[PDB]
Amino acid sequence: LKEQIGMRALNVAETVASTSLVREAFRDSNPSVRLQPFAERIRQKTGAEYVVIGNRQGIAYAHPLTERIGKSMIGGDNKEVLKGKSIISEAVGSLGPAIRGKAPIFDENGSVIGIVSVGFLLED
Amino acid sequence: TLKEQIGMRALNVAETVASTSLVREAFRDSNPSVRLQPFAERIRQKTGAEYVVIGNRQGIAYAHPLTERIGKSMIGGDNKEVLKGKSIISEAVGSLGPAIRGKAPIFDENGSVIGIVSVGFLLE
């Protein structure tokens, strides 16, 4: 069950990472203008705790707490995602145990330009 | 239950696809399949789904894992609740075995339903 909630998280992250809107926003001077409303819409519709979209350093362009945008970093190891891999991992935050999926964002030439990290609270 | 989580996986992918600007915009095109089919296929591949079918209000498939089925195949199962704006999880069977699927409505800018996304995962 924990594995399938992780697959929920990863499938949402992969779908967000493959959306043209997300890839295109990284060409904007402020990617958050387009990234944050989309991430929030997806977070609401799917029941996720967060849909965080960040650059290669993990700096969040989108975050469920808008005051954290540009300040918070995608938590956990991101080295594998920067290699183009998709990663499921367990984590914890103030709201409790979570499982998250991270997917790379690719440009038109296959380079990783960012990370999508989607987390679900471990709860029925 | 693991089956219920696989159904949430299917529905979360369908909801995320249905919320993308590409999918909402493509329904205005002369041939929506030109933009819908490559996106649906990419999401199908990345998520491990058996199918990401995108259809119109009458259920005609504009994207399908078999390109020869575009236009000929209809989204299977009751769609009446989706046209009412509801998201629905259901079980079905096909040539490849039992599957669980989730259906989400596609909305235009005025909140009218313009189509359906149906995502299916094989129970395996």
Numbering used by the authors:
A (entry chain C): 34 to 157
B (entry chain A): 33 to 156
The authors write:
Membrane bound histidine kinases (HKs) are ubiquitous sensors of extracellular stimuli in bacteria. Here, we used solid-state NMR in conjunction with crystallography, solution NMR and distance measurements to investigate the transmembrane signaling mechanism of a paradigmatic citrate sensing membrane embedded HK, CitA. In accordance with the naming of the PASc domain, the periplasmic domain is termed PASp here. The PASp and PASc domains are connected to the TM2 helix by two linkers: the PASp/TM2-linker and the TM2/PASc-linker (topology and domain organization shown in Fig. 1A).
